[PDB]
Design a protein around this ligand. Structure first.
Ligand SMILES: Nc1ncnc2c1ncn2[C@@H]1O[C@H](COP(=O)(O)OP(=O)(O)OP(=O)(O)O)[C@@H](O)[C@H]1O
Ligand SMILES: Nc1ncnc2c1ncn2[C@@H]1O[C@H](COP(=O)(O)OP(=O)(O)OP(=O)(O)O)[C@@H](O)[C@H]1O
Ligand SMILES: [Mg+2]
Ligand SMILES: [Mg+2]
Lengths: 110, 391, 391, 105
């Protein structure tokens, strides 16, 4: 499982994961890095709308991974690096520099 | 400012008052809430007398600043408690399970009631992962068991109550904001806001004053009185005040947004919960001058029960804490004061005969063998003869 | 350190205390548990007196060291027992079946009511596969049927209880850790932790040892005394001790993180479970010198039932091994002692008549032709006349 | 682009690159050794906090250089040699030996 920090990130960066993203694109990369199952990919892969595949990808994902690695190491490869960069920035304004998360990486999207 | 309203409505939060607002307090209930974000599982208590206006302030404190919802906390859950039965502390959480649940699967709602607590509790903290930093408002807590569970659920919530003792059972730190009686200057504003014959004349000013006195700043009962001004006349206000020191809130009772049309109906509940032996102590505390700073010994005279006359003080402190019925001033000397509002209700609901005997016992113990000092003058009935003759 | 909290919360484990933490013990409950990682289906008993603080220590022992959860054991299941009915030992396991179950299929959970014991038991050890490394905490056992269930299913257990004899039924791994009365030096720290005024004047210091002698190291009623001392002054403490010598624990009774407002309310339950004939023995213990090492024959005088006076001692041993109601020593000579707390409990509970009756019986057997030696002077010893006067 | 070794180094020696360093100091030296662009230096040069200029310098850098040379050859000149020494030590305990950690503990 993740936690409040790693799940708060998937939620904060949600206005964005809706405008450009697709869970079908990540299913192959995750059945692989060992974080899914052949029913998992079935469940998220056959979904009429994308907000469905997205809400199932973010639900299923928060349970399966020991951390938020194999999803930054994916928006990179998928030419959606403007995404994996935002999330890695957010994970950094928490461990090393505390406090700075709310003024810097949280407010500019109110 | 349109997303809030979506979130407010769905969290079952009432609309804030707009005509008149206790800014300082609303502005003090928002501040303390902002200070608590990183810290998880916290209690904010708005302890105050019956109808002291606590619940309205939570409506406003979550309705003025839009930061509280969206910026500081993602969602709101506002649930009214008012639980007295032992099943109530469990029933509240069943209503807090479906609240937290999705619009989908309210259809598949199971018999959660026929499920054990260890399940309702686990079942809640199992779905609570959906919403992080969730704020819960618990309008009107009377019992303490809820807190016991909540602390087991690592939960953070705002709390409107008339008592404060429950925190002792709790052990995760707490903060507090007391809804005091409406200050004199403030009241005026409240009236003007609601529209009242503007105070202008002397005898009238002196007549408008008397009004507040009886209410002694209780917002709810300051509303319940204002609604008795159909003529919109200060003269009428004088008339009502006169009716009060005789008939009592009963005559001034009226339909109001508040839960209790009559404040005596409210305070009832504050007199039932009261410790039984402690209940007696209070019951004989209706023989003292209203709104007067008066000594402990002078009280030792009417109150039931060696140099353990301190027992009088213990009752007066507990009674002042539970329901904030009483109030004790530490300095210069340990003295309490039966607020007129706290005084009239008891007077009308209790036994005059008890008070009569009570008054007798008072006089006796006094004989014994704003700077009042009856230390050397305990036996001073005439002092409040105006009050005592009433008995 | 964030994965634990996930695991603690889901295993329904309460938050560990922080203001005051025991050590040696917590460090002795962890050690023995590590030794048994290889061992399976073992019992750890935190046998101790009531309100003596056992349950809090399990909260801390599973909350300080993160190894216990993750390293030594994979998951935690903490369930409060408190079962008295015969259906209770079955009901506990129904609550331990859903605990062990998945978040999925709590909605599809069938009716355990129809499920029989052979089924609930088989049904549990059938799903227990998906949890090989699982420790179960059974806060507050007061029965043995549960121990039998555990022996049957081959299972691991931390156990908080007051009565230690329950383990006799089982024939598996059994170790023990006793939560003693808080030592004198320790207490100080506890109060210091709670910011109790610091001892300064000899007279004020005089009070210090006394409350302890009274509270005989009972954390709960120490917490209760603290909830009482709002003024936070040694004077307050003295006054409360006074109330107690005149009001028992009722005087110190108050709301607290304890499920119980009064300790007498707790100990009740320790006097109901007692063997009918053992109940009497306890009931007469009131007429004894409190916190004093006193001989068996001395007790033979007040206790109900020839050379077989050993039976009286038997009663004293059994009574001492059930919630630690009694306390006895082996050397120099077989003597027991009625902890001040239990003595007060007895005094306040037993028929006002019996107290005199018991002392009368003592007198009846008081005649005959710390190094107390009444073996040679029992007939003419009244060293506890002080206490005797209390009667 | 770099790789896992050269990027694992910029990450391992990160507790340090936060206590004493500044991307403004290196921008001129890198627009030069041909590894940046006049928008690159603009982007990292106008940043309110340094953890911003640092996170952008380490993001932008990992893409641009064919190797981890022009950053050791900089902490040297900048009196921050206690840095370029740590990173050169790390690149060596991998360049001169074919053995490390495997999937383990
Ligand atoms: N700011 C306010 N503006 C207008 N009316 C108020 C205000 N505060 C209190 N009142 C009066 O009190 C009634 C509700 O009181 P409120 O619920 O705010 O007090 P309370 O402390 O919650 O009492 P309780 O604890 O019994 O819920 C309203 O119907 C109104 O008559
Ligand atoms: N380490 C501690 N720190 C603070 N309070 C304590 C501590 N230990 C015991 N207490 C007091 O005792 C109460 C709970 O006692 P606890 O549950 O630990 O004892 P217990 O042996 O479980 O009693 P029971 O067997 O009846 O459950 C707390 O509310 C607190 O007042
Ligand atoms: Mg209300
Ligand atoms: Mg307990």
């Amino acid at each position: 499982m993740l936690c409040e920090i790693e799940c708060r990130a998937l939620s904060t960066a949600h206005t964005r994961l809706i405008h450009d993203f697709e869970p079908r694109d990540a299913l192959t990369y995750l059945e692989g890095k060992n974080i899914f199952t052949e029913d998992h990919s079935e469940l998220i892969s056959k979904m009429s709308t994308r907000l469905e595949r997205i809400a199932n990808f973010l639900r299923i994902y928060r349970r399966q991974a020991s951390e938020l690695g194999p999803l930054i190491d994916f928006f990179n490869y998928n030419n959606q690096s403007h995404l994996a960069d935002f999330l890695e920035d957010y994970i950094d304004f928490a461990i090393n520099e505390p406090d700075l998360l709310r003024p810097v990486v949280i407010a500019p999207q109110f | 400012r349109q997303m809030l309203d979506r979130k407010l409505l769905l969290g079952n939060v009432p609309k804030q008052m707009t005509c008149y607002i206790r800014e300082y307090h609303v502005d003090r209930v928002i501040k303390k809430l902002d200070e608590m974000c990183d810290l998880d599982s916290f209690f904010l208590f708005l302890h105050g007398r019956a109808g002291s206006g606590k619940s309205v302030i939570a409506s406003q404190a979550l309705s003025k600043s839009d930061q509280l919802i969206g910026i500081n906390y993602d969602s709101i859950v506002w649930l009214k408690d008012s639980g007295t039965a032992p099943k109530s502390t469990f029933d509240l959480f069943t209503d807090i399970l479906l609240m937290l649940k999705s619009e989908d699967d309210l259809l598949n709602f199971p018999s959660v009631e026929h499920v054990t607590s260890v399940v309702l509790k686990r079942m809640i903290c199992n779905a609570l992962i959906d919403r992080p930093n969730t704020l819960f408002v618990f309008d009107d807590v009377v019992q303490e068991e809820t807190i016991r569970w909540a602390q087991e659920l690592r939960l953070r919530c705002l709390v409107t109550t008339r008592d404060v003792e429950i925190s002792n059972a709790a052990s995760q730190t707490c903060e507090f904001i007391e809804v005091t009686s409406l200050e004199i200057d403030e009241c005026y504003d409240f009236l003007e806001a609601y529209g009242m014959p503007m105070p202008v004349g002397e005898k009238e000013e002196d007549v408008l004053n008397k009004t507040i006195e009886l209410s002694s700043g209780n917002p709810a009962t300051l509303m319940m009185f204002f609604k008795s001004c159909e003529p919109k006349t200060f003269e009428k206000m004088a008339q009502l005040n006169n009716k009060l020191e005789s008939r009592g809130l009963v005559g001034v009772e009226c339909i109001t947004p508040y839960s209790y049309k009559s404040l005596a109906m409210a305070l009832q509940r504050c007199v039932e919960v009261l410790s039984d032996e402690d209940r007696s102590a209070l019951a004989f505390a209706v023989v003292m001058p209203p709104g007067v700073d008066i000594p402990v010994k002078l009280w030792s005279c009417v109150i039931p029960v060696e140099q353990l006359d301190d027992e009088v003080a213990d009752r007066l402190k507990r009674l002042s804490k539970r329901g904030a019925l009483l109030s004790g001033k530490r300095m210069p000397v340990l003295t309490f004061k039966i607020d007129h509002i706290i005084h009239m209700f008891l007077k009308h609901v209790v036994d005059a005969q008890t008070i009569a005997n009570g008054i007798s016992i008072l006089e006796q113990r006094l004989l014994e063998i704003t700077v009042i000092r009856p230390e050397d003058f305990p036996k001073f009935m005439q002092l409040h003869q105006k009050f005592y003759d009433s008995l």
